[PDB]
Amino acid sequence: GPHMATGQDRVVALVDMDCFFVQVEQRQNPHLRNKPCAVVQYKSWKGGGIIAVSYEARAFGVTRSMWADDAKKLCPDLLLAQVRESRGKANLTKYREASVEVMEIMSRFAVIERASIDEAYVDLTSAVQERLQKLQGQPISADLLPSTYIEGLPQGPTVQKEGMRKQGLFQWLDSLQIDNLTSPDLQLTVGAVIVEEMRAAIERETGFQCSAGISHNKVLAKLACGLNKPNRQTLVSHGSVPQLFSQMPIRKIRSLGGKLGASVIEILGIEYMGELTQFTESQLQSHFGEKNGSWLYAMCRGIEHDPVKPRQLPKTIGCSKNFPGKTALATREQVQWWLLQLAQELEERLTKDRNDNDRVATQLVVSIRVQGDKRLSSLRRCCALTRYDAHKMSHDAFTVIKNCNTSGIQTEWSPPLTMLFLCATKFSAS
DNA sequence: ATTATGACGCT
DNA sequence: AGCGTCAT
Ligand SMILES: Nc1nc2c(ncn2[C@H]2C[C@H](O)[C@@H](COP(=O)(O)NP(=O)(O)OP(=O)(O)O)O2)c(=O)[nH]1
Ligand SMILES: [Mn+2]
Ligand SMILES: [Mn+2]
Question: Which positions in this protein are listed as binding a 2'-deoxyribonucleoside 5'-triphosphate?
Fold first, then answer.
């Protein structure tokens, strides 16, 4: 009872940009704004592959992973923006730079953990304590939470979406105990006030809209963020978890959408996250390993301890290109030329990183996939990265992979290469 | 012929 | 170190 810690000692937020690459292109080209729009890579095969979709286009069924030609079948008026091509490959620099814009704004409010190109976690515990001190026991006005949903509310004792949002927020605020500076629900609420401010700053200073989740840990904050996209934020309280999880398919939790989640479902004969509560920690560890079992035991109760890492910058800088079907690389000249193209993009990104961030990569990882291998990487080899020189980097990558070529002929490459991947790692302060 | 990444955990 | 998983 009293000693049963409830995982309520942090306030954590997840901010995720809405249809990010689309918004970057819509900012640049006003003709794309408020339109069914998608961003594609390449064009020749099937119109190119969609990687981002505006909410207007989603209404027609357009999704990521879909070929543009098929998306145009669903949405004949769909507008498309193509990712830049440089050195024969997709070049995502514009979106990385836009990401830095957003990350730098978020860092004004708190130390952030860059989780992807378009989203970051925020540990707001300390900022919340500060704002609570300033509030001096003053209640929180609904006016300070103009885009916030309270998950699970309204409940009990109404036709529009905004009305339901406000009804739930009123029910939440009316139940708050604002004289207790240690109440977790009050802390989450102040966290949501701060996140409104953060999202307002992002939109004012970049033009980009985002959604956010506020809860007591990273998993719940991420889940919360997705509940009311776009352009809204959602508060998931500890108390909302039993009802939320009682009908939550296990695969919606970050980390359980793959083989492990399928094994939870099949071994235990359950469907929803809430059903996990009936098992002991030891039973879950027996099926899924010590670490996974402890994580599942706490997570189905709303408890997760993974810290918000103080990391605004990516840990690696990588360049990759697939060569599908008849485009697979079958000669040594081809392999060398594309290793050089990848290495030249890598050199440019690494040099900019060194200038911006006062660090140097020290390890080069070379990954290839070979024809007939379904795995992502057929082979990974590391070597030293001692100079930011594309020619050296590509020569070294060739040296570490050249023993893969089973061809007796010096010129041919067999079996052909369907992917090249260069990734700079193990950064050191310079 | 989804593609381009990037984060990890395992052994 | 190299491989596998998850993510999108
Ligand atoms: N190159 C590449 N980029 C991708 C891929 N998947 C996503 N991206 C890029 C394009 C995405 O814009 C960006 C962020 O990914 P999300 O947050 O998962 N999706 P979004 O922000 O679009 O919509 P929502 O409002 O639902 O969050 O990452 C991919 O497979 N490949
Ligand atoms: Mn997003
Ligand atoms: Mn995202």
Answer: 64
Bases of chain C below 7 A from a protein C-beta are 1-8
List the one residue out of A345, A337, A356 whose CA is nearest residue A398: A337
Distance (Å) from CA A101 to ligand 1 centroid:
17
Six-digit token string for A385: 């990265």
Rounded CA separation A97/A259 (Å): 34
Beta strand A210-215 pairing with A148-150: unpaired
User: Two tokens at A21?
Assistant: 């690459």
Task: Write out the DSSP string of A213-267.
Answer: EEESSHHHHHHHHHHT-SS-EEE--STTHHHHHHT-BGGGSTT-SSHHHHHHHHH
**Ligand located closest to A230 CA:** 1
Resolution of the experimental model in angstroms, please?
1.5
Span from the CA of A181 to the centroid of ligand 2 (angstroms): 33
Nearest atom of ligand 1 to the alpha carbon of A22 = 12
> In this structure, are residues A181 and A81 in contact, taking their beta carbons and an 8 Å threshold?
no
- With a 6 Å cutoff on the Cβ, whether A118 touches ligand 1 is yes
